Amino acid sequence: SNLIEVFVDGQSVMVEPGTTVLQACEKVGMQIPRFCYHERLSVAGNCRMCLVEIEKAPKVVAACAMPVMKGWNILTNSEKTKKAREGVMEFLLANHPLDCPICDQGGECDLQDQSMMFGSDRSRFLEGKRAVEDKNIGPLVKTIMTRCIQCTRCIRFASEIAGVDDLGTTGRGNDMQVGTYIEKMFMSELSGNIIDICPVGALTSKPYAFTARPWETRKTESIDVMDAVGSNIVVSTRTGEVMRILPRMHEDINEEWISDKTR
Amino acid sequence: KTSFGSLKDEDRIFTNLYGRHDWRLKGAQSRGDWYKTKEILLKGPDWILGEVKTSGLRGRGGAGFPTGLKWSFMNKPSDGRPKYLVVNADEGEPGTCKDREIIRHDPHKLVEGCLVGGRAMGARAAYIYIRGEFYNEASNLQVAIREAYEAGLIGKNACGSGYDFDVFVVRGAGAYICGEETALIESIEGKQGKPRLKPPFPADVGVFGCPTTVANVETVAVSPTICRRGGAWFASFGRERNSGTKLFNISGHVNNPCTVEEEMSVPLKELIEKHAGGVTGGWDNLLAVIPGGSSTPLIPKSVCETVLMDFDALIQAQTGLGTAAVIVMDRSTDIVKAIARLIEFYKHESCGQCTPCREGVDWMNKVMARFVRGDARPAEIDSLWEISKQIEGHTICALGDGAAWPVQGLIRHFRPELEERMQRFAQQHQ
Amino acid sequence: PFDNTTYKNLQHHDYSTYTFLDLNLDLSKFRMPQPSSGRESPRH
Amino acid sequence: ALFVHRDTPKNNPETPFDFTPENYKRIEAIVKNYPEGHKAAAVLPVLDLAQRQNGWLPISAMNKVAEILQVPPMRVYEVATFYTMYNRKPVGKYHIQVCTTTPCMLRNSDSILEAIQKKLGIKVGETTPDKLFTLIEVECLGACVNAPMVQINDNYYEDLTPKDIEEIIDELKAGKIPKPGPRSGRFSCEPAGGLTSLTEPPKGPGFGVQAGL
Ligand SMILES: NC(=O)C1=CN([C@@H]2O[C@H](COP(=O)(O)OP(=O)(O)OC[C@H]3O[C@@H](n4cnc5c(N)ncnc54)[C@H](O)[C@@H]3O)[C@@H](O)[C@H]2O)C=CC1
Ligand SMILES: Cc1cc2nc3c(=O)[nH]c(=O)nc-3n(C[C@H](O)[C@H](O)[C@H](O)COP(=O)(O)O)c2cc1C
Ligand code: SF4
Ligand code: SF4
Ligand code: SF4
Ligand code: FES
Ligand code: FES
Ligand SMILES: [K+]
Fold it and tell me: How far is the alpha carbon of D191 from chain B, nearest alpha carbon, in Å?
């Protein structure tokens, strides 16, 4: 075996060559915070939330993209790693809108959860925020683009898994908008899964819009019957009424997606 | 040598820097260009890489990486993929207009540099990513490339050496971030000019997926002069690890803003008062100097009296050399208005890819726009410092660093002027 | 006669909107055949 | 200034745009510069060619560049909205671009911006009613030692005073095309009071060449 030896917080772990720093931390049971990294999408590296300190190296590295070298001691809990996480979270929350009560992603928001876990507890942003025009990409995906953190999971999903190539980024800088640039309707057969991978309430489910909330939902693991694929799903109910259908991960069937009919 | 500067005209690389001679082929061959190019090409890649390593040439793009060490990343066997030299002719740095002068006035020097450098790195072609705003310079360069093909100097059997080498010119379309080498690669490939992450370095995965070296116009154009005159000739100028000659663009509040080729470790005061006629209103009228274009931290008058204009003495002066573009600012300057305009430039020229630049450069522009009016309190100065330290080092490319450093230089050298601006705002609006 | 008084770079006073592209069209005959990735596009 | 498209009657996918055949030969020469299998690398020249044939980019130039390069139209929309030259609105026949960054603001580009405003009767972003002049405010055009300077459609007009840009606008209204140069005494970039360097004649071939070459 050509396994090399790397260290995560001093603990030795043997990894295949070409392993990213995030996967080396994942082998010892530690999850690095991330927003643009998705294990079934291509590596973008454009949110900088995964920046971790390699010791004896005066620069944090993007753990979602950086391959490990032999003998790196990855410091997941060191001081400049935590300062990197807090700074990146503060920039993510600077122009982000105060919509958490009126947002469907609340209670199941990655931005909320790892703001609580890895960021500071207050604001230094003494300016006015941006507001982005909402797009119309279909009767399934509600679009509130002020909540977008520009992580490009949209675009990588629609390009690589749905094979659509119609989502994209227009503009430059703080005015970079994720959309289709035209009045175009994103209707694939897998067009609902962008609601799953969007870590914020920028893309939400329009049938599930405003109706429930994830802490009060009972998660019943079940099977799809709409096709013969047998896609493993979660039926989430609330007070004896079906609220939504999410995917379960099964590596051999539906990897973590479902079709729009199933959803 | 101990004191540096006062470069002689016989020791110049960029003869016809001023457009005073014929830039075409019969003028260029009458000035030493395209002379014994075949004898440079036939001596192999290792000899040319050794002459560039001997010369001590560092990257003239602005970061100053050792050019021979950078170009020896391509001295590796073919893996089926072609290899590409890519000339970075964007030059979007405020203050910097030297590559415009090389392309406009010494284009055959750049074409011979493409040939010699791509021979050193085994490259197949040269993509000169020129700035889109430099249209006349691009057609100027294309006329020179046509003259180089019709003389058989490039193309099929370039200079009679049995080496095939093309030279292409790709025009930009108005993005400062497309001078960053990976974003320039992404712009040649027909996409948005967003920088790639490193690694893979462009020598591994570069333009089109190929082994690729992106190098500045100056560090490519001086390479046939290094091969002809010898590496030790080029290493005999400037301090140690600061070798060679350098183009300087002295603009702003000087009497005669100009481009000048000067020896490397020249003093800043000597360069200004010798080639630019000095600061307007005298040297006592000097307030600040941005030494190397917009990305470097500024230095005040008490640093500009003694500082040398190379990489290392400006790093020790807690700034950088950069593009050696000297922006001089006199005592009549609202320096907060100039630095806030510079941060406004960096939020207009920022590709929006990663979080700290996309959000924090706009947030620094809003804070600097309030600091111009003084519509703030002094605890927001240190806070702004922290914002810069959260942008610096955490971004994908160095435009976040280049946006953080003017803020940090302005705070570090002019915190009392910011505080008096804000307290006089407070006492005239309350 | 050595002249260092006149600006010899006067050709760009007569560049039109198609000078660069017609120069590329002229240079298209001098160039080596392009390499091939082995497919028509990365979507093929 | 927006980055979403709305179909106006004069900007829609039914707006007539098509290349001229000499521009099709120019597009063939562009696509032959890139490797076989990376035709998408010709998005930025060809689309800029569409800005030179038409003056601006409707959403039929973008779709035509998408169609003749076999790329998705969103990948052309991204290039058109990323790069600041691609006019997605019709501009005037002379597109005045004043640089106002720090090396030009320090040499009083504000007076020239004010001069163009009080001359044309417009402000930044507006087009004159005869559709001949569009005035905007751009970043560093890379002519910093020739500050202050403007760009008109290919050309740099440098070392300008307000009288010089008034005269350039006067002779653009009269139909003639001026000389792209510094309106002070110097020629390109030399020191303004005479050459401080490169006074000696250039040496020529063979000077200083090392042995063994
Ligand atoms: N000339 C201009 O118009 C402008 C110049 N700049 C300059 O650009 C500088 C930043 O440039 P960067 O390339 O981002 O900085 P630097 O970190 O990356 O790298 C400089 C060069 O060295 C090479 N290199 C460095 N380490 C390497 C390694 N381990 N393996 C392979 N190659 C390696 C890189 O490929 C690059 O070409 C700034 O300091 C600034 O002065 C900035 C803006 C505009
Ligand atoms: C935002 C940004 C813009 C840059 N623009 C240029 C440029 O316009 N021209 C240039 O030669 N280098 C530019 N660079 C530096 C390049 O990254 C690279 O170091 C250089 O082009 C080639 O290396 P060299 O200095 O050895 O020639 C830029 C860097 C950054 C971060
Ligand atoms: S996306 Fe998350 S952080 Fe933003 S409003 Fe919704 S719940 Fe709150
Ligand atoms: S809408 Fe969501 S998935 Fe798409 S880029 Fe924005 S944050 Fe990422
Ligand atoms: S820091 Fe700014 S310039 Fe660099 S990849 Fe990110 S958005 Fe682009
Ligand atoms: S997770 Fe590595 S940067 Fe987004
Ligand atoms: S600053 Fe105006 S041209 Fe560079
Ligand atoms: K979501």
Answer: 5
Residues of chain D in contact with residue A175, where contact means CB-CB under 8 angstroms, are: 3
Residues D53, D111 within the same domain:
no
Give the number of beta-carbon pairs within 8 Å between C and D: 61
- The number of domains in chain D is 2
- Cα A164 to middle of ligand 8, angstroms: 19
Would the CB atoms of A182 and D59 count as touching at under 8 Å?
yes
Count the neighbouring beta carbons within 10 Å of the beta carbon of residue A92. Answer: 25
DSSP-derived 3-state class of residue B288? strand
Both D182 and D96 in one domain: the answer is: yes
Method: cryo-EM
User: Shortest CA distance to D198 belongs to which of D189, D210, D185?
Assistant: D189
Same domain, D114 and D79: no
Nearest alpha-carbon partner for B265 in B312, B299, B304, B297: B312
Q: Could you tell me the end-to-end alpha-carbon distance of chain B, in angstroms, rounded to an integer?
A: 60
D chain contacts of residue C37, beta-carbon cutoff 8 Å: 35-38
Rounded to 10 degrees, the C-alpha dihedral D139/D141/D146/D147 comes to -10
Nearest-ligand number for the alpha carbon of D104:
7
CB atoms within 10 A of CB D199: 10
Could you count the other beta carbons within 10 Å of the beta carbon of residue B96?
A: 30
* β strands within B44-141, DSSP E: 84-89, 125-130
Q: Is D151 helix (H, G, I), strand (E, B) or coil?
A: strand
The domain ranges of chain A are: 1-212, 213-263
> Across-strand partners of B167?
B126
Please tell me the distance from the alpha carbon of residue D64 to that of residue D60, in angstroms, as a whole number: 6
Q: Is the dihedral of CA D141, D146, D149, D155 positive or negative?
A: negative
- D150 and D135 Cβ atoms separated by less than 8 Å: no
- Can you tell me which residue has the tokens 């095309």? D177
E strand spans, chain A: 4-8, 11-15, 51-54, 61-62, 73-75, 141-143, 168-170, 177-179, 203-205, 218-223, 232-238, 241-247
Q: Please say whether the beta carbons of B180 and B398 come within 8 A.
A: yes
Kindly report the length of chain A.
263
CB contact under 8 A, D32 and C28: yes
Q: CA-CA distance, C9 to B141, in Å (whole number)? A: 12
Backbone φ, ψ for residue B34 (5° rounding): 60, 30
The set of protein residues with a Cβ atom below 6 angstroms from ligand 4 is A 148-154, 178, 197-198, 200, 202-203
Buried b / exposed e across B9-38, counting CB within 10 Å, b at 16+?
Answer: eeebbbbbbbbbbbbbbebbbebbbbbbbb
| Same domain (yes/no): D83, D102 | no
Query: Do D98 and D82 sit in the same domain of this protein?
Result: no
Q: Which of B392, B403, B398 is nearest to B346 (CA)?
A: B403
Contact B330, B338 (CB under 8 A): no
Structure tokens of D126? 């507006």
Would you say residue D209 lies in a domain? no
Q: What is the rounded distance in angstroms from the CA atom of residue D146 to the CA atom of residue A60?
A: 41
Give the length of chain D. 213
CA atoms within 13 Å, Cβ hemisphere of A46: 21
Residues comprising chain C, all counted? 44
Asked if the structure places residue D211 within a domain, the reply is no
Resolution of the experimentally solved model in angstroms: 2.8
Q: Which residues of B touch D52 (CB under 8 A)?
A: none
| Ligand 4 centroid – CA A154 distance (Å) | 5
D51 lies in a domain?
yes
**Could you tell me if residue D21 is inside a domain?**
yes
Distance CA D76, CA B196 (A): 20
Give the residue from A155, A143, A228, A126 showing the smallest Cα distance to A183.
Answer: A143
B336 token code pair: 């907060």
The domain containing residue D59 runs over which residues? Answer: 17-90
Query: What CATH number was assigned to the domain covering residues B25-235?
Result: 3.40.50.11540
